[PDB]
């Protein structure tokens, strides 16, 4: 029903979350962006290499306990 996730930045920042196994993962992203004080669209969140959809759920991604989410600065080539 409930797991702990570690959200790790490439800047070495780390926040852990208690998250409901059935929840929409955008809530995690909102909370994280809320805490860091940056817009939601400025960050990208990955799990096992893949982007996390706002409607994705820890269940649907097969997230186990103490699994890691990696977060990256949004960027574009030029």
């Amino acid at each position: 029903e409930y797991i702990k996730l570690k959200v790790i930045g490439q800047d070495s920042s780390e926040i852990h979350f208690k998250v409901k196994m059935t929840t929409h993962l955008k809530k995690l992203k909102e909370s994280y962006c809320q805490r860091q004080g940056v817009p939601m669209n400025s960050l990208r969140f990955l799990f096992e290499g893949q982007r996390i959809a706002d409607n994705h759920t820890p269940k649907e991604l097969g997230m186990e306990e103490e699994d890691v989410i990696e977060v990256y600065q949004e960027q574009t080539g030029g």
């Binding site: 070495s12 920042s13 926040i15 852990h16 409901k20 929840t23 809530k27 909370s31």
Partner: protein, 61 residues
Amino acid sequence: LDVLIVYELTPTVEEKAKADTLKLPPTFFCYKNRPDYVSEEEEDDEDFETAVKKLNGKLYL
């Protein structure tokens, strides 16, 4: 509650001062505090050529 923050990695006063001086992320030196850390590892002579060599052609976990 659906999601709850239970932890935030925060640097010590010393680590934060060191990072701030270099304009580094405030948690940059936190790798130094954890069970895994041995220590310096004082002498760095390695070059690019040998570092690539030490890969042994293995790019992925």
